Enzyme design. Structure first.
Site, PDB file in Angstrom:
ATOM      1  N   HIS A  40     -24.001 -25.680 -33.834  1.00 42.15           N
ATOM      2  CA  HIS A  40     -25.259 -26.105 -34.427  1.00 42.15           C
ATOM      3  C   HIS A  40     -26.104 -24.927 -34.899  1.00 42.15           C
ATOM      4  CE1 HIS A  40     -27.264 -25.671 -30.352  1.00 42.15           C
ATOM      5  NE2 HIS A  40     -28.295 -25.359 -31.117  1.00 42.15           N
ATOM      6  N   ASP A  84     -19.541 -28.248 -29.625  1.00 43.75           N
ATOM      7  CA  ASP A  84     -20.573 -27.368 -30.172  1.00 43.75           C
ATOM      8  C   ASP A  84     -20.218 -25.901 -29.949  1.00 43.75           C
ATOM      9  OD1 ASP A  84     -22.894 -26.503 -31.344  1.00 43.75           O
ATOM     10  OD2 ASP A  84     -24.218 -27.094 -29.695  1.00 43.75           O
ATOM     11  N   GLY A 175     -34.262 -21.757 -29.071  1.00 43.03           N
ATOM     12  CA  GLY A 175     -34.123 -20.343 -29.354  1.00 43.03           C
ATOM     13  C   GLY A 175     -33.011 -19.712 -28.542  1.00 43.03           C
ATOM     14  N   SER A 177     -30.223 -21.389 -27.923  1.00 40.70           N
ATOM     15  CA  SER A 177     -29.010 -22.006 -28.456  1.00 40.70           C
ATOM     16  C   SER A 177     -27.962 -20.992 -28.881  1.00 40.70           C
ATOM     17  CB  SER A 177     -29.339 -22.884 -29.665  1.00 40.70           C
ATOM     18  OG  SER A 177     -30.126 -24.000 -29.303  1.00 40.70           O
ATOM     19  N   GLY A 178     -26.712 -21.260 -28.516  1.00 46.01           N
ATOM     20  CA  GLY A 178     -25.619 -20.378 -28.883  1.00 46.01           C
ATOM     21  C   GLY A 178     -25.390 -19.258 -27.888  1.00 46.01           C
TER      22      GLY A 178
HETATM   23  C1  LIG Z   1     -31.069 -31.498 -29.388  1.00 48.25           C
HETATM   24  C2  LIG Z   1     -31.705 -30.621 -30.431  1.00 48.25           C
HETATM   25  C3  LIG Z   1     -31.876 -31.183 -31.764  1.00 48.25           C
HETATM   26  C4  LIG Z   1     -32.477 -30.421 -32.827  1.00 48.25           C
HETATM   27  C5  LIG Z   1     -32.918 -29.073 -32.576  1.00 48.25           C
HETATM   28  C6  LIG Z   1     -32.762 -28.482 -31.261  1.00 48.25           C
HETATM   29  C7  LIG Z   1     -32.155 -29.248 -30.175  1.00 48.25           C
HETATM   30  C8  LIG Z   1     -32.036 -28.553 -28.826  1.00 48.25           C
HETATM   31  C9  LIG Z   1     -31.417 -27.325 -28.558  1.00 48.25           C
HETATM   32  C10 LIG Z   1     -31.562 -27.092 -27.194  1.00 48.25           C
HETATM   33  C11 LIG Z   1     -31.119 -25.978 -26.382  1.00 48.25           C
HETATM   34  C12 LIG Z   1     -31.422 -26.014 -24.964  1.00 48.25           C
HETATM   35  C13 LIG Z   1     -32.154 -27.150 -24.393  1.00 48.25           C
HETATM   36  C14 LIG Z   1     -32.457 -27.192 -22.940  1.00 48.25           C
HETATM   37  N1  LIG Z   1     -33.619 -27.839 -22.447  1.00 48.25           N
HETATM   38  N2  LIG Z   1     -31.567 -26.583 -22.001  1.00 48.25           N
HETATM   39  C15 LIG Z   1     -32.590 -28.257 -25.225  1.00 48.25           C
HETATM   40  C16 LIG Z   1     -32.279 -28.210 -26.661  1.00 48.25           C
HETATM   41  N3  LIG Z   1     -32.544 -29.065 -27.671  1.00 48.25           N
END
Ligand SMILES: Cc1ccccc1-c1cc2ccc(C(=N)N)cc2[nH]1
Ligand SMILES: [Ca+2]
Length: 223
Positions: A40, A84, A175, A177-178
């Site tokens: 993503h 993902d 932020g 993510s990844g």
């Molecule tokens: C689900 C989603 C849709 C569109 C944009 C961002 C996200 C998203 C990424 C993400 C990374 C981490 C977490 C978390 N609370 N561990 C939640 C998240 N949520």
């Protein structure tokens, strides 16, 4: 990272920042030429930044390298975030040192209860917004699949696992993510998704890397 702590400069040498004019996702260096991140996080014009601590200040140990190719997992489903994971090849090999090092891939899946290290430059607030300049860290245990699936009914696949605390207060976030989830010296997870951040009974969801080792190894060897 919410409820975490300042890692310390270059204490997570495999952590990378993906930059497209600004930091937008994390990643993990798996060898001098490849980075693993979340599907993503895919986008064009990615520059990989290694050896980073404060992402807004050039401190002296960074390496900025453009991506030459990005490979999103063939089965990635953006609607459900199943599979993902994505690979990014560096245009030039990174120079490995104490501050820029690779993290090994798992040879087996980690069990529930295992403590892991999650890191990133994501938001540090559960309610509201505040983005750090320096790398944040969080120690969190892998949760049972039952607790994971109970928190997200009909949303968890065999390619995902949860980690964190059901009581809330500690979790990865927007932020991060990844980014990496390292357990016992192996990259077992990738920051993928979750409900809000650090919310009660809503732990973080991570891509289960052990299911992709064959794909990663074969893909890197053929590209
Ligand atoms: C689900 C989603 C849709 C569109 C944009 C961002 C996200 C998203 C990424 C993400 C990374 C981490 C977490 C978390 N609370 N561990 C939640 C998240 N949520
Ligand atoms: Ca920097």
């Amino acid at each position: 990272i919410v409820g975490g702590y300042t890692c310390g400069a270059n204490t997570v040498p495999y952590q990378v920042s993906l930059n497209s004019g600004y930091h937008f996702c994390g990643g993990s260096l798996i060898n001098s030429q490849w980075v693993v991140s979340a599907a993503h996080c895919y986008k064009s014009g990615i520059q990989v930044r290694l050896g980073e601590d404060n992402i807004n200040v050039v401190e002296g140990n960074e390496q900025f390298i453009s991506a030459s190719k990005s490979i999103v997992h063939p089965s990635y489903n953006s609607n459900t975030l199943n599979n993902d994971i994505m690979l990014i090849k560096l245009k030039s090999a990174a120079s490995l040192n104490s501050r820029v090092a690779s993290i090994s891939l798992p040879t087996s899946c980690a069990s529930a209860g295992t403590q892991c290290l999650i890191s990133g430059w994501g938001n540090t607030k559960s309610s509201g917004t505040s983005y750090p300049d320096v790398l944040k860290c969080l120690k969190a245990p892998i949760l049972s699949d039952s607790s994971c699936k109970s928190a997200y009914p009909g949303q968890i696949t065999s390619n995902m696992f949860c980690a964190g605390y059901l009581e809330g207060g500690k979790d990865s976030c927007q932020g991060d993510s990844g980014g990496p989830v390292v357990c016992s010296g192996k990259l077992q997870g990738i920051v993928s998704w979750g409900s809000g951040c650090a919310q009660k009974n809503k732990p973080g969801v991570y891509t289960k890397v052990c299911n992709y080792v064959s794909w990663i190894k074969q893909t890197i060897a053929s590209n």
